[PDB]
């Protein structure tokens, strides 16, 4: 069995959602906040994979949220794999269909 190690939460007990996850754009930074007000504590991993290389920036702003952003030089469906405390959540990996924005000048 075990001795006794406190630890509540767990991958499943982790939700993620943002205005960027739903959809993204090529050349534009896609930010998104992760709702971790359920799980007790744990690490977080982000990996954006797709037809091209995507930039990633992690900056701890507060204890509540961290704020993660990623830019895709090329359009396409970037699959961002999110692992909590070394565990795959029922919401990952994520599929963000990025596209190249066409502006008329």
Swiss-Prot record:
It comes from the Eukaryota. ISGylation prevents ability to interact with the upstream activators of the JNK cascade and inhibits IFNA-induced JNK signaling. Ubiquitous. Isoform 1 and isoform 2 are expressed in placenta, bone marrow, brain, umbilical vein endothelial cells (HUVEC), retina and skeletal muscle. Isoform 1 is predominantly expressed in prostate, uterus, liver, thyroid, stomach, lymph node, small intestine, spleen, skeletal muscle, kidney, placenta, pancreas, heart, lung, platelets, endothelial cells, megakaryocytic and erythroleukemic cell lines. Isoform 2 is predominantly expressed in spinal cord, platelet and Daudi cells. Signal peptide: none annotated. Filamin repeats lie at residues 8-98. It is linked to Interaction with FLNA may compensate for dysfunctional FLNA homodimer in the periventricular nodular heterotopia (PVNH) disorder. Atelosteogenesis 1: A lethal chondrodysplasia characterized by distal hypoplasia of the humeri and femurs, hypoplasia of the mid-thoracic spine, occasionally complete lack of ossification of single hand bones, and the finding in cartilage of multiple degenerated chondrocytes which are encapsulated in fibrous tissue. Connects cell membrane constituents to the actin cytoskeleton. May promote orthogonal branching of actin filaments and links actin filaments to membrane glycoproteins. Anchors various transmembrane proteins to the actin cytoskeleton. Interaction with FLNA may allow neuroblast migration from the ventricular zone into the cortical plate. Various interactions and localizations of isoforms affect myotube morphology and myogenesis. Isoform 6 accelerates muscle differentiation in vitro. Homodimer. Interacts with MICALL2. Interacts with RFLNA and RFLNB. Isoform 1 interacts with FBLP1, FLNA, FLNC, GP1BA, INPPL1, ITGB1A, PSEN1 and PSEN2. Isoform 3 interacts with ITGB1A, ITGB1D, ITGB3 and ITGB6. Interacts with MYOT and MYOZ1. Interacts with HBV capsid protein. Interacts with ASB2 isoform 1; the interaction targets FLNB for proteasomal degradation. Comprised of a NH2-terminal actin-binding domain, 24 internally homologous repeats and two hinge regions. Repeat 24 and the second hinge domain are important for dimer formation. The first hinge region prevents binding to ITGA and ITGB subunits. Belongs to the filamin family. This is Filamin-B. It comes from Homo sapiens. The gene is FLNB. The chain holds residues 2190 to 2287 of 2602 of the full protein.
């Amino acid at each position: 069995g075990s001795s006794g190690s406190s630890g509540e939460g767990g991958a499943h007990k982790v939700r993620a959602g943002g205005p960027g996850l739903e959809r993204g754009e090529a050349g534009v930074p896609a930010e998104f906040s992760i709702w971790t007000r359920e799980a007790g504590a744990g690490g977080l991993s982000i990996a954006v994979e797709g037809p091209s290389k995507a930039e990633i920036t992690f900056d701890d702003h507060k204890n509540g949220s961290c704020g993660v952003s990623y830019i895709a030089q090329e359009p396409g469906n970037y699959e961002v794999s999110i692992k909590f405390n070394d565990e795959h959540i029922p919401e990952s990996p994520y599929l963000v269909p990025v596209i190249a924005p066409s502006d008329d000048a």
